[PDB]
Amino acid sequence: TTCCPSIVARSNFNVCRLPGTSEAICATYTGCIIIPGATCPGDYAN
Numbered sequence: 001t002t003c004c005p006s007i008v009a010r011s012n013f014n015v016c017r018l019p020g021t022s023e024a025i026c027a028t029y030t031g032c033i034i035i036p037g038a039t040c041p042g043d044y045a046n
Contacts, residue, residue, distance in 0.1 A: 001035050001036075001037065001038045001039075002027070002033070002035075003032060003033050003035060003040035003041065003046075004031070004033075004044060004046040005031050005043065005045075005046065009030045009032055009046065010030075010032065012029070012030045013026050013029075013030045013032045016029055032044070
């Protein structure tokens with residue numbers, strides 16, 4: 001599951017993904033994170 005710290009971080013994440021970039025690269029690029037579970041924390045609410 002991906003969790004993002006802000007709205008624009010998510011928007012940027014989704015653009016990064018469009019060419020097929022790995023989630024892990026897009027995470028470090030944007031500040032989003034990948035977790036194994038499905039429950040994002042309150043500080044990665046977007």
